[PDB]
Structure 1
Amino acid sequence: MIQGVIQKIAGPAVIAKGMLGARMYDICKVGEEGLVGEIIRLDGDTAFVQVYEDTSGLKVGEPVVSTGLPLAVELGPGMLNGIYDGIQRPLERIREKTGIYITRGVVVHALDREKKWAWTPMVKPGDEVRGGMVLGTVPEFGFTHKILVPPDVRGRVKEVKPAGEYTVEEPVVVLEDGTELKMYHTWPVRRARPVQRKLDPNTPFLTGMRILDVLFPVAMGGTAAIPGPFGSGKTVTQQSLAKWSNADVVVYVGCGERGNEMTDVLVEFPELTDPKTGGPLMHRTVLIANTSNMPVAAREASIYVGVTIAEYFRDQGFSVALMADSTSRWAEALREISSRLEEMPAEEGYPPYLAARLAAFYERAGKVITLGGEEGAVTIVGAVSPPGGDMSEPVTQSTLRIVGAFWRLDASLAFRRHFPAINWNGSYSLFTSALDPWYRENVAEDYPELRDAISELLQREAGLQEIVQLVGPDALQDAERLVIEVGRIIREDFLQQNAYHEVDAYCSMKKAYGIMKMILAFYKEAEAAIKRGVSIDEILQLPVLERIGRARYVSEEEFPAYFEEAMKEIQGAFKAL
């Protein structure tokens, strides 16, 4: 409804007058063809409009038009399970109408208006509408998808289209007082949904991985980050992550990553299957991809996309699980945009905002309470990766500042084989503290006392081995060997699992607890042997250790019992000598 005419054309920037009353930052089809654009410095009756794609071929006299709408996300049911680009374009309607490439000048929608969903308008007309309020469900892979009002609306309900088929585009119910309401409603990326109470963290988060929670929890609503040079197994984790989870909605979305590996995600994703229903995994999933090459301001928005969409789902009461990677690359786009806008850089080369937009990406999360009065999980775990190759370049040490837990993964430890290879000695999580109450509630009650206790083991190996190991394990004394023998066990069981065993690749608190428990409990009595000067290198061959040796492989149904017999036997191997 506001139409302009092109005036100058300077690559990405274009300038066109015939436009006043314009609004800062919007879509806009520009060209005879038309392509999405963006208002930045307006002036008078013109604005500079940034038309993201390869501009090439435009002439002058082509009309310009605005939607008067900021770049927004479209949020409704049916979004899940598919693949999209930065500005939310679902690839399948693409593939058919392009063949190979993705041609420019394609318009679609997120949600196909061709599917007729059947539902229930879970209320009655004659009511009070309030923002954030309930409305109605359809099911899509076994979901209670509560289609809720967009917030900031309220009044009277009149007339309620009953159950039955409707395609998405068709409206639902209405207010007397003007304005209907469609099923889905759009949301600006920049703001964040208003929510009613942040709540303190104090809620666990499962991941099942031993090393993950017992030592370095993150808490649900937690926020972590993980670096990890590649060519070293880092994706493994990301896979397993979603596999068990503790949430139920998986959103994974990175953006840009040297070609082929970005395609790996795509392929292995459908093959994996939920291990909670036996339903195909892709069902409760939503992927956004974006590959290097892809248009600049695509990529810049990319994260933010993922962030919003996560909030949506969050808002519905579920617990969610976003993943994102290539945060290190994220800044890239930012540099680029700031290249084409002449604003000085600062610091190393990434403009300054990289202590804010980077910030906000993380803030939005924790333990939100909905306006719907329920609880919804938004942990983000921060992949980053510099083949700048340091724990010092801006990006990383920025994340580190805001988020709370750092799960360092490193190649070196990995080369010896032992996957996951989260290298413990360099990792940390400020988190633990506040988790302690719930910690002690649920697991055991001596529970903390164990984690701290066992960590010391490795610690007192680190600075012993370090030096003294250039003599082997035979010029050591008594207890000296004992530490590293035990150490071995911490490293041959408590550590290393696998992600290829139905028997183990998943746990629970209560399982690990026993595990660790036994390992102190065999060790303290190991020390009573050497304190009497008993044969040492005999302890090191007793059958008891093999009952540990199998312990990981013990299956979860048999797990209680397996402690039951095994444990008390420990008591008895020392009586023997």
Structure 2
Amino acid sequence: MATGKIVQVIGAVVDVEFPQDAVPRVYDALEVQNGNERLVLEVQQQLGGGIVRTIAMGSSDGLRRGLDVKDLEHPIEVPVGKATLGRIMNVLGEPVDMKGEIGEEERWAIHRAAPSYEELSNSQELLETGIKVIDLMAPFAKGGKVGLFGGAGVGKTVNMMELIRNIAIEHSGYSVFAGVGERTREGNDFYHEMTDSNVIDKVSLVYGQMNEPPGNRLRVALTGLTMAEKFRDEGRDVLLFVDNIYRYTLAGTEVSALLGRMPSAVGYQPTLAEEMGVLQERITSTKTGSITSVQAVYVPADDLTDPSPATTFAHLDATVVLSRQIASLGIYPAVDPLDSTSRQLDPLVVGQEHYDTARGVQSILQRYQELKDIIAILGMDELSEEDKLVVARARKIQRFLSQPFFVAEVFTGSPGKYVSLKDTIRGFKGIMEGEYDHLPEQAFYMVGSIEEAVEKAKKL
């Protein structure tokens, strides 16, 4: 039986009227036949007498005023468990890989509360990665959040592919990839890459892409979190990769005004902070299990002042800040060594040696930045000889931060390099102590360990 009727269709927002008894409650799901298409609506507001205002989980085209609506008395529920591994799904947990039914044993609602404060679990189990600058400036522990900040085209996706390769393959546990607002081509390429590498059997994929109406882009992240939290409650260690938190917030912004809300400071919704918090406080490592998450964060206009990157800075253990300046200069990855940090970079948590090395590198590069304009206008020879020594060491250090990746091999035509953390510390310690003062700048550029630096120096 059907119980409601559509009364307004404005853009992507649909109003449905019900009898004043048994009105659907917030975040419930509703169903309507958009011609032959089964269309799901999600209730967002109980407003007025018997009327609820909803968002379509599909194209709003083809809807008429007066269509019957059937109220399902549960939120959007998705399959969870081992059956989700190796399958692509949409926001509603429906397969989009044309392999057939999911075959799930259990289904879970995507709206659920965060762990209580006394459920939280403390961890300092440092992960090792092949990327030099990340392990040096911002090492991170198992069970923590990582965010790769960056503007358009600065290397977020390439770094995330490299980190998937480096971390997930050694990881023996299940992993979840949430493609929030991704380009269709890059999702297909990721799927085929995992299928070729034979690691698709331990990854669950949820894709909500750029072309889909705002509700899908709004709720796909919650679908991904639901699957990851099922694995966490089973007791396993999970790896969760989220392609863009930015377009979760942006999918909120598109529909906010149509919901009757008054606009905020920079045109955002008034509920930006709470909408970020409810999602991001679920991504935590509890005492039963741990979720380790890597998130790519878009930076509008390459300006870190914008409210979205500003608020997401306050949620992360380790923040690798990519910069368009360093990318334009051709240094890859474009990590800014002065801005990138991690709260695991303690002389107690890491080796005391490691801490001192990181602090010294940052001090030297900070001292170079102030001299940049001095030298640019007044000239190189105005410097003291100690200053000129510092300039030399600064340029060599800023070269040694670069690295070729296995997944950045197609763009450049060179093999990929993996550096152990001990070797990274040893190389930067040697450079700062002047053991390689006499090598040229390119002897450190695009190499691995410092032994490889001296080998290339011999070739030079």
TM-score normalised by the chain length of structure 1: 0.67
Mark the CA change 1:518 to 1:4 in structure 2 (over 3 Å): closer, same or farther: same
Residue of structure 2 in register with 1:451 after alignment: 358
The CA RMSD measured in Å over matched residues stands at: 3.6
SS in structure 1 opposite 2:119?
A: coil
Mark the CA change 1:340 to 1:461 in structure 2 (over 3 Å): closer, same or farther: closer
Does the CA contact (< 8 Å) of 2:91 and 2:207 recur in 1?
yes
Mapped partners of 2:405, 2:124: distance in 1: 28
Which residue of 64, 75, 84 corresponds with 2:80? Answer: 75
Which residue of 270, 286, 307 corresponds with 2:225? Answer: 307
Does the CA contact (< 8 Å) of 1:16 and 1:47 recur in 2?
yes
C-alpha distance after superposition, 1:202-228 (max 9, x if no partner)? 232333311112112343333343332
Does the CA contact (< 8 Å) of 2:297 and 2:309 recur in 1?
no
Residue of structure 1 in register with 2:31 after alignment: 29
Mark the CA change 1:10 to 1:508 in structure 2 (over 3 Å): closer, same or farther: same
C-alpha distance after superposition, 1:72-94 (max 9, x if no partner)? 2321212022322222222123x
Mark the CA change 1:234 to 1:14 in structure 2 (over 3 Å): closer, same or farther: closer
Q: Which runs of 5+ in 1 are unaligned?
A: 97-107, 114-167, 169-182, 527-538, 567-577
Mark the CA change 1:193 to 1:184 in structure 2 (over 3 Å): closer, same or farther: farther
Mark the CA change 1:14 to 1:471 in structure 2 (over 3 Å): closer, same or farther: closer
Which residue of 308, 321, 326 corresponds with 1:395? Answer: 308
Mapped partners of 1:319, 1:26: distance in 2: 31
Corresponding letter in the other structure for 1:253: A
Residue of structure 1 in register with 2:157 after alignment: 235
Does the CA contact (< 8 Å) of 1:20 and 1:46 recur in 2?
no
Per-residue deviation, 1:242: 0.5
After superposition, residues 204-215 of structure 1 pair within 5 angstroms as 204-215=126-137
Q: Which runs of 5+ in 2 are unaligned?
A: 455-460
Higher percent of residues as helix: 2
Rg comparison, structure with higher value: 1
Corresponding letter in the other structure for 1:376: S
Per-residue deviation, 1:201: 4.0
Residue of structure 2 in register with 1:348 after alignment: 266
Mapped partners of 2:215, 2:445: distance in 1: 53
Which residue of 252, 263, 266 corresponds with 1:334? Answer: 252
Residue of structure 2 in register with 1:506 after alignment: 418
Which residue of 490, 506, 531 corresponds with 2:397? Answer: 490
Residue of structure 1 in register with 2:94 after alignment: 89
Which residue of 220, 244, 256 corresponds with 2:181? Answer: 256
Mark the CA change 1:273 to 1:413 in structure 2 (over 3 Å): closer, same or farther: farther
Mark the CA change 1:553 to 1:432 in structure 2 (over 3 Å): closer, same or farther: closer
Corresponding letter in the other structure for 2:397: I
| Residue 2 of structure 2 corresponds to residue 3 of structure 1 | yes
Corresponding letter in the other structure for 1:509: L
Select the structure with the greater relative contact order (CA < 8 A; seq sep ≥ 6).
2
Per-residue deviation, 1:301: 0.9
Does the CA contact (< 8 Å) of 1:300 and 1:330 recur in 2?
yes
Does the CA contact (< 8 Å) of 2:418 and 2:448 recur in 1?
no
Mark the CA change 1:262 to 1:3 in structure 2 (over 3 Å): closer, same or farther: closer
Does the CA contact (< 8 Å) of 2:152 and 2:298 recur in 1?
no
SS in structure 1 opposite 2:79?
A: strand
Mapped partners of 2:83, 2:22: distance in 1: 35
| Residue 367 of structure 2 corresponds to residue 377 of structure 1 | no
Q: What is the aligned length?
A: 439
SS in structure 2 opposite 1:349?
A: coil
Mapped partners of 2:375, 2:9: distance in 1: 67
Does the CA contact (< 8 Å) of 1:410 and 1:423 recur in 2?
yes
Mark the CA change 1:551 to 1:521 in structure 2 (over 3 Å): closer, same or farther: farther
Mark the CA change 1:418 to 1:281 in structure 2 (over 3 Å): closer, same or farther: farther
Does the CA contact (< 8 Å) of 2:110 and 2:223 recur in 1?
no
SS in structure 2 opposite 1:13?
A: strand
Mapped partners of 1:477, 1:42: distance in 2: 72
Higher percent of residues as strand: 2
Mark the CA change 1:191 to 1:520 in structure 2 (over 3 Å): closer, same or farther: same
Segment of structure 1 superposing worse, 210-219 or 62-71:
62-71
SS in structure 1 opposite 2:72?
A: coil
Per-residue deviation, 1:295: 1.9
Per-residue deviation, 1:409: 1.0
Does the CA contact (< 8 Å) of 1:86 and 1:290 recur in 2?
yes
Per-residue deviation, 1:288: 2.2
Mapped partners of 1:514, 1:238: distance in 2: 26
Does the CA contact (< 8 Å) of 1:250 and 1:286 recur in 2?
yes
C-alpha distance after superposition, 1:29-72 (max 9, x if no partner)? 22375421233427776655554434444567754323311112
Mapped partners of 2:371, 2:243: distance in 1: 37
SS in structure 1 opposite 2:293?
A: strand
Does the CA contact (< 8 Å) of 2:7 and 2:66 recur in 1?
no
Which residue of 345, 370, 373 corresponds with 1:463? Answer: 370
Does the CA contact (< 8 Å) of 1:81 and 1:286 recur in 2?
yes
Corresponding letter in the other structure for 1:252: F
Does the CA contact (< 8 Å) of 2:402 and 2:446 recur in 1?
no
Mapped partners of 2:52, 2:384: distance in 1: 80
Per-residue deviation, 1:419: 0.8
Per-residue deviation, 1:243: 0.9
